[PDB]
Amino acid sequence: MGASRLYTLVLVLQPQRVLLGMKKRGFGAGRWNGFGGKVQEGETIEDGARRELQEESGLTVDALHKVGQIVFEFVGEPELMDVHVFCTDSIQGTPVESDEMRPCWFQLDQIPFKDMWPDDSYWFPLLLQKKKFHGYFKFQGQDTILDYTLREVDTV
Ligand SMILES: CCOC(=O)c1ccnc2[nH]ccc12
Known about the structure:
9-stranded mixed sheet, nucleus, Nucleoside Triphosphate Pyrophosphohydrolase, 8-oxo-7,8-dihydroguanosine triphosphate pyrophosphatase activity, two-stranded antiparallel ribbon, hydrolase
């Protein structure tokens, strides 16, 4: 309940590896993550996903697929974060470093969960298993999960 703000998150997932970026500034700096950000006025959610992927990594894609939705609450912040998660295996181009992100490929048994947001350990396996999901995570600061829910869905 309450006003929420729209965000995107894009995971480039190939058969034996996944592309992540080391966030170089701002919110989440110092952690590996997918590519994304705030959705702007005048663009769809999926347009916003492609825009952030191109700005942060130089990549474009043929198709994005909806895989999940995660709602974040941060203690003492008024806006909830409504994050729409997408995947793809159809990249056009070679990934390149930006002001915001330094991209690297990881093997699927070497995903660096110790240096990622702590909710990723819960929902990433569902992404890897190609299951669609709805998550909720309540955070105190950037390290501590106070409450969460997670379930599989038919419709994202
Ligand atoms: C795209 C904006 O997503 C983020 O703000 C965020 C916050 C907390 N855990 C997270 N895990 C992955 C992303 C993420």
